[PDB]
Every structure is written in structure tokens, then in C-alpha cells.
Amino acid sequence: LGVYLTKKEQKKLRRQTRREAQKELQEKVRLGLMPPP
RNA sequence: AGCUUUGCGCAGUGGCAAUCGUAGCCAAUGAGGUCUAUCCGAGGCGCGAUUGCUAAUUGCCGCCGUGACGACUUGCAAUAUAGUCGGCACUGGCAAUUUUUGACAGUCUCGAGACUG
């Protein structure tokens, strides 16, 4: 059994997926975990 | 035991300039139709931000000459140099052949010599 989802549920998922990742990386450079880009 | 094809997720590489989102609405109970209408087939409207940055940037080393102190070598004007060494004083002097602060271009001949701008 499978659910599909619409265009607007792709954006929201793609953006809220991307946002969490980049901001988490942002702190890593602040905290000095990661050499600064 | 390899190969192919579809969807999603995570990355690297190339190109394009309108994208993205909606606690708002309408929409297979049919959104939208200039074309063929007993036809087509899925988003449209309204609103707001391409979204964060990076590049940052600007208003103390030599000689000679003179004076004199001390010391040594010898006769002392009661009186200081007869000669040598040590150092101080002088907006003193110093730079066109011999040797450490000054000359280049090329040819030929037997380290040297001759010539050619």
C-alpha cells in the first residue's frame, strides 16, 4: 500500500529537510568542530 | 554469477532565467480552455520573499696637526717636556696611477705582446 504526496508537500519537506541540515552545520563552524569553510 | 529499466534519499560535474512558500480560496462531486465542442485534461487564483553569504574597503668605524695630564729613559731656570707610550679638547682637514674602497667592447699571435671604436 502507498501514499503519494503533492507538489507543496514536496517543497515543505525539501526545505525543512535542508534547513535543519545547514543550520546544524552552521553551529559546527561556530563551535569549532569543523574547520571553517 | 553479471546486465538493463522506474520511484525516493544523499553527493560531485554542466547549462538555463523567474523560483520559493501559503493555518487563504477553488479543484475528478472537474481547476482551465483561441482552435475539432457527444472535444481536450491538472493545477489555478490572491499575497509575500530570488533566500543566506564573502571580498571586505573607503571618507657610530681610520689618519694628521695643536694644547695639556700621567709614566719611563737623562742634564733640570726655584719653571713642565731633550726623546718614547696611554688618553681627553678643537660645527680642524681628508679622497683624479703604485699596492683594499675607482675602470669598459672585440680580434690575432707566441703568462706575455700587437691592433681594432
From Swiss-Prot:
Ubiquitinated. Undergoes 'Lys-63'-linked polyubiquitination by PRPF19 and deubiquitination by USP4. 'Lys-63'-linked ubiquitination increases the affinity for PRPF8 and may regulate the assembly of the U4/U6-U5 tri-snRNP complex. Highly expressed in retina, liver, kidney and blood. Detected at lower levels in heart and brain. It comes from the Eukaryota. It is found in: Nucleus; Nucleus speckle. It is linked to Retinitis pigmentosa 18: A retinal dystrophy belonging to the group of pigmentary retinopathies. Retinitis pigmentosa is characterized by retinal pigment deposits visible on fundus examination and primary loss of rod photoreceptor cells followed by secondary loss of cone photoreceptors. Patients typically have night vision blindness and loss of midperipheral visual field. As their condition progresses, they lose their far peripheral visual field and eventually central vision as well. Plays a role in pre-mRNA splicing as component of the U4/U6-U5 tri-snRNP complex that is involved in spliceosome assembly, and as component of the precatalytic spliceosome (spliceosome B complex). Component of the precatalytic spliceosome (spliceosome B complex). Component of the U4/U6-U5 tri-snRNP complex, a building block of the precatalytic spliceosome (spliceosome B complex). The U4/U6-U5 tri-snRNP complex is composed of the U4, U6 and U5 snRNAs and at least PRPF3, PRPF4, PRPF6, PRPF8, PRPF31, SNRNP200, TXNL4A, SNRNP40, SNRPB, SNRPD1, SNRPD2, SNRPD3, SNRPE, SNRPF, SNRPG, DDX23, CD2BP2, PPIH, SNU13, EFTUD2, SART1 and USP39, plus LSM2, LSM3, LSM4, LSM5, LSM6, LSM7 and LSM8. Interacts directly with PRPF4. This is U4/U6 small nuclear ribonucleoprotein Prp3. The chain holds residues 436 to 472 of 683 of the full protein.
